[model samples]
Target: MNRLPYFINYFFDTYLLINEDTPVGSSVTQLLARDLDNDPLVFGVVGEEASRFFAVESMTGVVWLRQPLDRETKSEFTVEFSVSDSQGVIKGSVNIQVGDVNDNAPRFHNQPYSVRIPENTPVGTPIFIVNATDPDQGAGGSVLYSFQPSSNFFTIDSGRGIVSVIRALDYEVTQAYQLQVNATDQDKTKPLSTLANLAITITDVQD
Candidate 1:
């Protein structure tokens, strides 16, 4: 019994990836630690975060998620593992990367946006800017802005989210207008969208 036990070839998959939407208490990855002495071994996770977010089976070495994952909160993790038998404890670690999905829909900071404009406001005038955010990563996190119920009088900039005038405002013709601003995530497979309220009031100007 002079030789110390060591992990066999293909001991682990160091580069691991999982979707952020992966359900809680689901099997993530099976840990691979075997003893050559054919002795029963005790296995456990060896990390503060790894211990918090993950759990290892006592004898089977299966890793499971302890809670929901959010890539925005943390995208990567280093998980340490240890296996013990009469011989000794063998410790090792792996890096796990969290992938993204279209789980989070775009969100607006506030709703029922209101803006006042003089009837003489010229075309292509920026009245107000809208803010929306997506918490997902990659394309899932990319946000798109657009104005619904299209009117020739109003236009919106997709990138800048500018609520602008496409035509001259006439307070006599229209006193006020209610519009819906839509924010959408650019995820190709599954795009998510949310709606906000916008109110425009026309102020009389000396002609």
Candidate 2:
């Protein structure tokens, strides 16, 4: 083992940030190592997960993606490599950070949600529960609900995806109320939104 001072900086900071959808065979970045002799040497990655998904050019030390990467599967990876020459061997570490991608959009489980409620129903009545799903992770997969045109009589629970009557309803005022509900993901780069039509029919209550 080469006894170099732990605090001494050997190579440039080996941190690489890569997008989740980087195509296979694309060169990510190059790794650098410093030997006692300070001469150019061959380098190769040496980690199980790293080798499975990445490769290094023998002569240039450029790291390339060998397979597709999914951020949801793994967010970060640490790979070790060595620089070797006739004199000695020097090792280095590379940290690859995966960035999120909005590859998945929110999908409504039931479309055109319709329900019937009695006129003069109590406030805060649960009308219908809407369901949606996102396949991504973190902010990319988090879903929120809201009325499309904004509603005064209806309210939507952002986290629970529940739609309820906020104000009292009257069949004499309107037979049915129609509105569009929207589900959106928290992905800031490429937020995805979906719409579902809601029909609320107010049935007349017996006098």
Best by lDDT: 1
Residue-level lDDT of model 1, residues 60-173, one tens digit each, is: 778899998888888887777787787678877777788877888888986669999889988877899998988887787888788876767888888888888998778888
lDDT of 2 by residue, 15-97 (tens): 67889999999998776555554555676777787789889897777879999888878888887766666555566676778
> What value of lDDT does candidate 2 attain over all alpha carbons?
0.79
- TM-score leader: 1
Name the 10 consecutive residues with the lowest summed lDDT in model 1: 2-11
Model 1, TM vs. native:
0.83
| CA displacement after TM-score superposition, residue 30 of candidate 1 (Å) | 0.8
In model 2, how large is the Cα lDDT of residue 130?
91
